[PDB]
């Protein structure tokens, strides 16, 4: 797997987020992660840190796992990285999002999650309090 760069447009929710790449704009969905919607419980807390993270970013990087590549809503399925931190894994470990999904071959960071999520968890934080 390799880091590309990319341009943050911008944050939509908690586990999307709009980015130039490749000369366009594109809708990523980050792999592996379920944030709440902003109308359910800690939806809002998960939009705002993400947005946080990645306004905040000096450096954004995309980075496709081996399986499918886009969803069937044409949004790009990766991991972002803001400044090297994976958004995904800082949700997930903020106890903000779930570890979720998992197929069409997307799981090279399946483990280093769910990890995250059980620390989380143990840690009776935000989603799991
Ligand atoms: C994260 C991810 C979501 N999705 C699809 C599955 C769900 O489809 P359906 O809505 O058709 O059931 C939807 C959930 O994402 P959202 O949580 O952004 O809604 O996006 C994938 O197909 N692959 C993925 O890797
Ligand atoms: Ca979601």
Same mark, same amino acid.
């Given at each position: 797997?390799?880091?590309?760069?990319?341009?943050?447009?911008?944050?939509?929710?908690? *586990?999307?987020?709009?980015?130039?790449?490749?000369?366009?704009?594109?809708?990523?969905?980050?792999?592996?992660? *379920?944030?709440?919607?902003?109308?359910?419980?800690? %939806?809002?807390?998960?939009? =705002?840190?993400?947005?946080?993270?990645?306004?905040? =970013?000096?450096?954004?990087?995309?980075?496709? *796992?081996? %399986?499918?590549?886009?969803?069937?809503? /044409?949004?790009?399925?990766?991991?972002?990285?803001? *400044? /090297?931190?994976?958004?995904?894994?800082?949700?997930?470990? $903020?106890?903000?999002?779930?570890?979720?999904?998992?197929?069409? /071959?997307?799981?090279?960071?399946? $483990?280093?999650?769910?990890?995250?999520?059980? $620390?989380?968890?143990?840690?009776?934080?935000?989603?799991?309090?």
């Amino acid at each position: 797997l390799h880091k590309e760069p990319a341009t943050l447009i911008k944050a939509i929710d908690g *586990d999307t987020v709009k980015l130039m790449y490749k000369g366009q704009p594109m809708t990523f969905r980050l792999l592996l992660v *379920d944030t709440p919607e902003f109308n359910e419980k800690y %939806g809002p807390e998960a939009s =705002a840190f993400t947005k946080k993270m990645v306004e905040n =970013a000096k450096k954004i990087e995309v980075e496709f *796992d081996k %399986g499918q590549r886009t969803d069937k809503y /044409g949004r790009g399925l990766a991991y972002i990285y803001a *400044d /090297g931190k994976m958004v995904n894994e800082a949700l997930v470990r $903020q106890g903000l999002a779930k570890v979720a999904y998992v197929y069409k /071959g997307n799981n090279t960071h399946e $483990q280093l999650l769910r990890l995250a999520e059980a $620390q989380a968890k143990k840690e009776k934080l935000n989603i799991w309090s």
